[PDB]
Amino acid sequence: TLSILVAHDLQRVIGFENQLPWHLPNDLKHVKKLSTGHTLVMGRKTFESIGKPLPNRRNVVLTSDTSFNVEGVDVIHSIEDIYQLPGHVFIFGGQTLFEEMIDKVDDMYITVIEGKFRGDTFFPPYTFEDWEVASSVEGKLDEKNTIPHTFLHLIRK
Numbered sequence: 001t002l003s004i005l006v007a008h009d010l011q012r013v014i015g016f017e018n019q020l021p022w023h024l025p026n027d028l029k030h031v032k033k034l035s036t037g038h039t040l041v042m043g044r045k046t047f048e049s050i051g052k053p054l055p056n057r058r059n060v061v062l063t064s065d066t067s068f069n070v071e072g073v074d075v076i077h078s079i080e081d082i083y084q085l086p087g088h089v090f091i092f093g094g095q096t097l098f099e100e101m102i103d104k105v106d107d108m109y110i111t112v113i114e115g116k117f118r119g120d121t122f123f124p125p126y127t128f129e130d131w132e133v134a135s136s137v138e139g140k141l142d143e144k145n146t147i148p149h150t151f152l153h154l155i156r157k
């Protein structure tokens with residue numbers, strides 16, 4: 001399976017100045033649950049924003065840099081390489097990769113952050129006319145998760 005995995009706000013912001021604009025531990029756990037034991041594919045800038053590979057899953061970075069080498073990271077150099085990756089593969093970021101892959105993926109796991117943040121990085125527009133809602137689960141608010149958020153699993157019609 002090829003899936004998108006993304007958290008975006010009400011205006012599809014996903015990033016600002018190399019950071020996630022919000023602090024939502026529930027969503028980090030969501031990502032850990034979905035992608036542990038599987039594969040994340042991300043563009044070079046997203047990887048550098050993170051700074052290191054995420055544990056207990058395959059980390060694949062897409063770059064044109066033939067010198068790029070990071071222990072624990074597998075490098076690919078073309079979009080076509082993604083399709084040769086075995087198992088459940090999650091397109092993880094950023095804006096550029098999402099723009100390249102949104103018309104190709106089977107389904108999307110979206111965390112909708114119910115706020116309006118300043119951003120410089122955006123998920124591409126999509127329409128629910130093209131996507132069936134397999135599930136929609138509101139995240140719980142608490143001490144450490146203080147912005148409303150909803151977990152969507154959308155499947156291409």
Ligand SMILES: NC(=O)C1=CN2[C@@H]3O[C@H](COP(=O)(O)OP(=O)(O)OC[C@H]4O[C@@H](n5cnc6c(N)ncnc65)[C@H](OP(=O)(O)O)[C@@H]4O)[C@@H](O)[C@H]3O[C@@H]2CC1
Nearest residue numbers: 014015018019043044045046062063064093094095096097
């Ligand atoms: N929540 C997120 O996903 C976040 C992502 N990070 C943001 O991405 C922000 C905007 O840059 P963006 O172009 O969207 O970055 P991504 O696609 O990760 O990475 C772009 C890089 O992937 C590579 N490029 C993507 N498509 C291809 C491709 N088709 N072939 C070869 N390389 C790929 C290429 O790397 P390279 O310059 O080292 O060659 C390209 O410049 C950038 O400012 C990063 O900060 C945010 C923090 C939040």
Ligand SMILES: CCc1nc(N)nc(N)c1C#CCc1cc(OC)cc(-c2ccc(C(=O)O)cc2)c1
Nearest residue numbers: 005006007018019020027028031049050092093111
């Ligand atoms: C974790 C945020 C996130 N949520 C969902 N649902 N989908 C995604 N694709 C991303 C993402 C991403 C890229 C990214 C950028 C970044 O720049 C600072 C940081 C992270 C990040 C931060 C914390 C953790 C963690 O503690 O588990 C993991 C990734 C992750």
